[PDB]
Amino acid sequence: SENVQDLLLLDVAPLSLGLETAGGVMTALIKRNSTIPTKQTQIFTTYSDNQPGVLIQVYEGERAMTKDNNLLGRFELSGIPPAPRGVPQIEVTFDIDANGILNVTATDKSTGKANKITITNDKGRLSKEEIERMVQEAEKYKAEDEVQRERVSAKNALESYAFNMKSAVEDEGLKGKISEADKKKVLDKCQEVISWLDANTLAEKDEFEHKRKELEQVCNPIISGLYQGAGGPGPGGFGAQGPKGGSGSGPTIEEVD
């Protein structure tokens, strides 16, 4: 079901075979799922002028910039007349036969010299599992690689020294030598066309839930109590006696004797 196999049918290119072309451009001439014998003849030029020898190197997979992919083989075509940019015409005939042998012929139209390589795709690098992953990643990040790849567009070309680990010159500015610059560079956000980023305008939507209680009863204490006020008496027994009657100043009634 997921597996469907019998015989025949898979008489196609399992990989997308490409070349390192311009500096940062992988051109896949024979793309996967294309029935073999396949062929693609494309004429390339060099931006890199005055190069008497160019490097044709075959990679499998797809990336924007030629790296992170598999390498089948390479060959260096010498004979190219040291001419300006876009002048050397390299005819590259890239074809796979019925066995699955990729033959890449680079023919310099300028001189007439041709060098080819014969590579069977029956055998390969890695085991295969990694290659399948590589293809899947190439599909997966394809959109990203497409934009990246097509950002380096002008003309089909092959670049020699297409990796600046150490650049030739990169400080020609007016500094000590000619200290009068003021401004000779006016733009940055101009000259090169502006692209718009894709705004993904979608908002979220929430959900909540909150259902559980701990207070089962509502206890409301009511006053329920009585009392009795007790009272008592007091001993009110008071009375001041004053016996009198027959006491005082008592002379002999008649004075002296």
Side-chain angles (χ1 to χ4, degrees):
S1 50
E2 27 56 90
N3 172 270
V4 179
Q5 63 186 31
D6 183 70
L7 194 66
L8 300 315
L9 181 64
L10 203 176
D11 301 298
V12 304
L15 272 297
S16 37
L17 300 310
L19 298 175
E20 212 308 81
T21 51
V25 180
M26 180 181 178
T27 300
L29 296 74
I30 296 175
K31 303 176 182 62
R32 62 276 158 176
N33 297 329
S34 307
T35 181
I36 62 179
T38 36
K39 68 192 74 174
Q40 292 287 89
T41 303
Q42 305 183 152
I43 301 173
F44 295 91
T45 49
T46 58
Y47 302 137
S48 51
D49 58 269
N50 271 86
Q51 303 302 149
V54 296
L55 174 60
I56 301 74
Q57 46 182 330
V58 187
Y59 288 74
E60 307 184 291
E62 280 198 283
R63 304 296 179 160
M65 302 184 182
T66 328
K67 67 188 190 71
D68 294 288
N69 288 334
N70 187 32
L71 194 172
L72 286 176
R74 73 172 203 142
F75 64 97
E76 303 182 278
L77 175 66
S78 53
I80 292 69
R85 317 181 85 204
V87 180
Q89 293 183 88
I90 308 299
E91 184 183 88
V92 179
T93 302
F94 197 95
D95 68 89
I96 302 179
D97 85 319
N99 293 271
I101 303 170
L102 176 62
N103 281 270
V104 184
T105 305
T107 309
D108 172 53
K109 295 186 169 298
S110 323
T111 53
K113 179 170 297 186
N115 286 85
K116 64 72 177 176
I117 191 175
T118 303
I119 303 176
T120 180
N121 291 89
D122 182 272
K123 299 179 179 180
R125 296 295 173 166
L126 293 306
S127 58
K128 192 184 189 68
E129 196 65 58
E130 317 90 312
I131 302 180
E132 296 295 85
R133 277 289 300 172
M134 181 181 300
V135 181
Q136 295 175 329
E137 292 289 275
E139 305 296 84
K140 176 179 171 182
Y141 298 99
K142 194 182 292 310
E144 303 301 273
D145 287 277
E146 294 302 287
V147 179
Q148 291 177 148
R149 198 200 315 221
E150 302 305 288
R151 277 194 57 118
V152 188
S153 45
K155 184 178 180 179
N156 289 275
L158 313 172
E159 283 297 271
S160 304
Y161 294 100
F163 182 69
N164 293 270
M165 184 62 179
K166 198 294 297 177
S167 305
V169 293
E170 183 45 71
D171 188 89
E172 189 186 285
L174 307 180
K175 188 188 303 176
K177 60 175 194 57
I178 304 300
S179 303
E180 57 182 280
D182 182 72
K183 54 178 174 297
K184 299 306 183 68
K185 178 187 172 305
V186 64
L187 53 71
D188 291 280
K189 303 169 61 63
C190 183
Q191 177 58 29
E192 188 184 286
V193 66
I194 305 298
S195 54
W196 185 71
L197 67 308
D198 186 62
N200 296 91
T201 310
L202 287 180
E204 287 299 280
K205 191 178 178 178
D206 60 75
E207 289 301 321
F208 300 108
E209 220 300 77
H210 190 256
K211 187 182 297 78
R212 272 178 181 169
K213 289 188 175 184
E214 180 174 89
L215 293 309
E216 177 170 273
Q217 291 178 269
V218 291
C219 300
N220 299 273
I222 56 177
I223 183 61
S224 54
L226 296 308
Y227 67 98
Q228 176 178 89
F238 299 98
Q241 285 60 88
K244 59 184 179 66
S247 183
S249 306
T252 44
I253 286 62
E254 60 288 319
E255 185 179 64
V256 187
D257 174 77

